[PDB]
Amino acid sequence: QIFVKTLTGKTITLEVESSDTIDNVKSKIQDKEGIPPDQQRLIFAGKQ
């Protein structure tokens, strides 16, 4: 004719937010982004 009562407790979280390895950024630089319409980029030649 009796009872059992017990509560609980929690811990939410911690974070660091660590990212961006160096090998991904070196590949991130050597690319293209697009050029409007007529914004050619050119070639050039010389030094015969």
E strand intervals along 1-48: none
Task: For residue 14, give both structure tokens.
Answer: 């911690």
- Considering the rule CB under 8 A, would residue 45 count as an interface residue with other proteins? yes
For the segment 18-37, give every residue that binds other proteins (CB under 8 A). Answer: 18, 20-23, 25-37
* Site size with other proteins, rule: CB under 8 A: 29
- One-letter amino acid of 8: T
- Considering the rule CB under 8 A, would residue 15 count as an interface residue with other proteins? no
The answer to whether the beta carbons of residues 35 and 41 sit under 8 Å apart is yes
Q: Which residues bind other proteins (CB under 8 A)?
A: 18, 20-23, 25-48
